């Protein structure tokens, strides 16, 4: 119960512990990952594609 959800959050945090504080670039990509949301009116960059070839999958 309490311990159940607690250790679930703790292992989710262990996944969230898998970082400092290629591997780094795929890690930031998984970290910095956009999605087809409806709020992109602010800047509308295209480099969202770049990570796919700039540093990740590179």
């Amino acid at each position: 119960q309490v311990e159940k959800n607690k250790i679930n959050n703790r292992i989710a945090d262990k996944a969230f512990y898998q970082q400092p504080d290629g591997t780094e670039w795929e890690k930031v990509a998984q970290l910095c990952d956009f999605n087809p949301k409806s709020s992109k009116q602010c800047k509308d960059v295209s480099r969202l594609r770049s990570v796919l070839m700039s540093l990740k999958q590179t």
């Binding site: 119960q1 309490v2 959800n5 607690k6 959050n9 945090d13 969230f16 512990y17 970082q19 400092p20 504080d21 780094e24 890690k27 930031v28 970290l31 910095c32 602010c42 800047k43 960059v45 295209s46 480099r47 770049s50 700039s54 540093l55």
Partner: protein, 165 residues
């Protein structure tokens, strides 16, 4: 109601999920007390929802800070992104330069690429000796600048051909 009592139970029962669904289901309560219960309930998700409803109660500058209390692995910045308000990335990104966790800093500069000036960018680049995810900043800057100069050309060309009449 039985609903609000059950929400208080889930607060005691250390349940946020059903508590979240329920606090979405009704408003017949305040969230300041909800904030106090969540932000100190030992779960990163409880404090997450407390910070969430902070700005929901028009109470900013602490929600992001509350996630910075518990959700350190960019999960603070994860919602600092959606916090929708400026005047955050400057100081927060400077602090995040202080502890060199640049692994998340790419996302930080990403979320608010819109409201940036290159001045501080070269400042922190030449300072922290950081070109990764800054050269791409160069690229996007020039790209949007290509767009600028070109649409400017379009506009001025139209204006001149008009005034030829």
């Amino acid at each position: 109601s039985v609903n609000e009592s059950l929400n208080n139970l889930f607060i005691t029962e250390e349940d946020y999920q059903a508590l979240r669904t329920s606090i979405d289901a009704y408003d017949n309560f305040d969230n300041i007390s909800l904030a106090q219960r969540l932000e100190k309930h030992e779960l990163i998700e409880f404090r997450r929802i407390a910070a969430y409803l902070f700005k929901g109660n028009n109470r900013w500058k602490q929600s992001v800070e509350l996630c910075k209390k518990d959700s350190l692995y960019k999960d603070a910045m994860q919602y600092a992104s959606e916090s929708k308000d400026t005047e955050l990335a400057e100081e927060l990104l400077q602090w995040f330069l202080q502890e060199e966790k640049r692994e998340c800093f790419g996302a930080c500069l990403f979320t608010c690429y819109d409201l940036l000036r290159p001045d501080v960018v070269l400042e922190t680049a030449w300072r922290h000796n950081i070109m990764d995810f800054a050269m791409p900043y160069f690229i996007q800057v020039m790209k949007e600048y290509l767009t600028k100069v070109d649409k400017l050309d379009a506009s001025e060309s139209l204006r001149k051909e008009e005034e030829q009449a």
